[PDB]
Amino acid sequence: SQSKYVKVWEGNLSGQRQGQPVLITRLEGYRSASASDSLAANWPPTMQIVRLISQDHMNNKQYVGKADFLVFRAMSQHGFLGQLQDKKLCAVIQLPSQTLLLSVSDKACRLIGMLFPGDMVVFKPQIPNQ
């Protein structure tokens, strides 16, 4: 598609470590157009974090040009202050098809996320592969 951002809304409850669910109901999220529409269209309501990503990892704009962006918009949360006050980050989601990173910083009612390819990028030509 052709755009810069894409906000989508949905509802579910699944997203923890070790393949565990999460306390969620209905929230929205804004992802950089750098991602595919089908992503939010059939986005998996269940996340599985097995790693940890710091805010310093997403501080690299030299990687946001080849990858997509994902932001979680919520009205409530728990523990957000802890990290945001400690180092300001979150856990990373390791998918067998792709790689998503979750890091909460300077956002109590929001979360920072990154969409990376499952080690199958067609990087080669010029311009930021969209």
Side-chain angles (χ1 to χ4, degrees), residues 6-56:
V6 278
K7 176 250 285 262
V8 277
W9 145 93
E10 260 252 320
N12 262 112
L13 11 68
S14 284
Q16 233 60 284
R17 55 263 226 70
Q18 318 222 37
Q20 256 186 242
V22 76
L23 176 74
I24 299 284
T25 27
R26 243 115 291 170
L27 281 315
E28 320 189 76
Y30 129 76
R31 329 92 45 68
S32 177
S34 281
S36 276
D37 285 4
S38 85
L39 207 300
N42 300 271
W43 89 293
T46 82
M47 321 195 270
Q48 50 281 288
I49 11 284
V50 193
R51 214 115 262 178
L52 14 155
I53 175 177
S54 356
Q55 166 175 17
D56 210 289

Side-chain angles (χ1 to χ4, degrees), residues 30-120:
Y30 129 76
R31 329 92 45 68
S32 177
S34 281
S36 276
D37 285 4
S38 85
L39 207 300
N42 300 271
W43 89 293
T46 82
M47 321 195 270
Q48 50 281 288
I49 11 284
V50 193
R51 214 115 262 178
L52 14 155
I53 175 177
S54 356
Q55 166 175 17
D56 210 289
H57 285 204
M58 59 87 60
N59 193 242
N60 283 60
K61 303 134 268 212
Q62 326 216 94
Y63 282 57
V64 306
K66 53 173 184 184
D68 345 307
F69 221 108
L70 327 159
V71 188
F72 223 55
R73 210 193 296 286
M75 274 275 245
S76 186
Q77 255 205 131
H78 200 43
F80 59 96
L81 181 145
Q83 311 126 133
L84 185 154
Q85 287 289 270
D86 228 323
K87 33 237 63 223
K88 319 117 144 109
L89 41 41
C90 231
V92 209
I93 291 83
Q94 199 199 26
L95 272 177
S97 178
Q98 294 193 299
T99 311
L100 158 65
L101 339 173
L102 220 58
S103 155
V104 285
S105 71
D106 313 318
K107 297 205 305 201
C109 315
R110 276 145 81 173
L111 299 89
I112 323 179
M114 310 294 297
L115 205 301
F116 242 59
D119 198 47
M120 288 276 255

Side-chain angles (χ1 to χ4, degrees), residues 1-3 6 33 35-37 130:
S1 46
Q2 313 93 62
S3 202
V6 278
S36 276
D37 285 4
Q130 197 167 64

